[PDB]
């Protein structure tokens, strides 16, 4: 029960799990906002607030490959966004059930934003574009920190992808500190790829997806998006995410030298702990915030209080996190079929509806186990499972 509540959209607010809220950065409406579990929200809202040069209606060439779909209705009524809710909601539960996913929302959630936001390197200090700003039942508002958001996407509505804010010159995704992340999905379309068969990728797949993402940089141990490999242009951060195969296009000697510079990162953080003498804010003492960066990093503490990082204890850690959170091992722990190859050249765009159980189960996804789709990843066939996946138009 990682989700502990059945969550409606049209529930009362309580401040505490069901709120509205506002998104760091301009003059913006209040959303209506669900903590599923501590640190991570759900915003059943297509994501027009954070990136301002960006209108839903189609553009005048849609180009995203192999497929895109623009809908700028998608998402606009208090029934799609119940449905948007309960869909997320599923897709964590579902993740949650296998044990490697258990082990990487674990470590999301764990994997608090460093304090570093303080113009001195002895004071602690909370970056505000970590937090949100909670409306109470009692009309006020109160800043939460907060490691997950999973937003409804921008106009392209089966482009997902992880985003963040950034600070100053700090490299937050990539300097060990991490960032809050927020997740561009849709649990109500899929995808298609081929296999030998017309087939939809499974949406705990591509929302696991994003998820090793958000855990890459939640731990500020993201590749450089400018980091990229030919492949007959694809990004280093992508091929670690996806695995198999395209994982070892990577050479062990950059492989080791990433490992060696993020060991060193976390060293920076440690020291910057021990070196600490103040903290900003009422909330939380210096003490407490030590010993949450000590959980996060897998910290050393000896008898005097002072930090150092284990090197077991990162490898470990920077191991699971780099080269066991990957979309091929998820694949192979649901049981489902899912492409080969990072790139896809299936021209296929499915509406889906996952939240009645006659049609996807958290165990079995769509190859729900006592039905002939239980066969040969039949569920995933559009053609023979098609009342389950509805063709719409390729915008490219
Ligand atoms: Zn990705």
Redesign the pocket.
């Known amino acids: 029960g990682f989700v502990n509540k059945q969550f409606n959209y049209k529930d009362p607010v309580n401040g505490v799990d069901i709120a509205y809220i506002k998104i760091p950065n301009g003059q913006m409406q209040p959303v209506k906002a669900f903590k599923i579990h501590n640190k991570i929200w759900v915003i059943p809202e297509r994501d027009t607030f954070t990136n301002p040069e960006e209108d839903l209606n189609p553009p005048p060439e849609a180009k995203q490959v192999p497929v895109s779909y623009y809908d700028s209705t998608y998402l606009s009524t208090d029934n799609e966004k119940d449905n948007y809710l309960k869909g997320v909601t599923k897709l964590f539960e579902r993740i949650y059930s296998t044990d490697l996913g258990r082990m990487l929302l674990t470590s999301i959630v764990r994997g608090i934003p460093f304090w570093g936001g303080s113009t001195i390197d002895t004071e602690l200090k909370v970056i505000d574009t970590n937090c949100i700003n909670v409306i109470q039942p009692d009309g006020s508002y109160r800043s939460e920190e907060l490691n997950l958001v999973i937003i409804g996407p921008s106009a392209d509505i089966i482009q997902?992808?992880?985003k963040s804010f950034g600070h100053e010159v700090l490299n937050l995704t990539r300097n060990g500190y991490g960032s809050t992340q927020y997740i561009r999905f849709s649990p109500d379309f899929t995808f298609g790829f081929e296999e030998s068969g017309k087939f939809a990728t499974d949406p705990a797949v591509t929302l696991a997806?994003?998820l090793?993402?958000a855990g890459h940089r939640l731990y500020g141990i993201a590749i450089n998006p400018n980091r990229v490999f030919k492949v007959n242009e694809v990004s280093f951060?992508?091929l670690r995410?996806?695995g198999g195969h395209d994982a070892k296009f990577i050479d062990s000697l950059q492989e080791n030298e990433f490992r060696l510079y993020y060991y060193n990162k976390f060293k920076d953080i440690a020291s910057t702990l021990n070196k600490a003498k103040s903290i900003v804010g009422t909330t939380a003492s210096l003490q407490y915030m030590k010993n949450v960066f000590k959980e996060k990093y897998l910290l050393s503490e000896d008898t005097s209080g002072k930090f150092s990082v284990d090197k077991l204890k990162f490898d470990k850690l920077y191991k699971m996190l780099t080269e066991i959170y990957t979309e091929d091992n998820f694949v192979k722990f649901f049981k489902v079929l899912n492409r080969k190859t990072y790139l896809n050249f299936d021209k296929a765009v499915f509406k889906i509806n996952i939240v009645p159980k006659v049609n996807y189960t958290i165990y079995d996804g769509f190859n729900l186990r006592n039905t002939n789709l239980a066969a040969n990843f039949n569920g995933q066939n559009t053609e023979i499972n098609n009342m389950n996946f509805t063709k719409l138009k390729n915008f490219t």
């Open positions: 997902f992808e992880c997806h994003e090793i993402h951060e992508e995410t996806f």
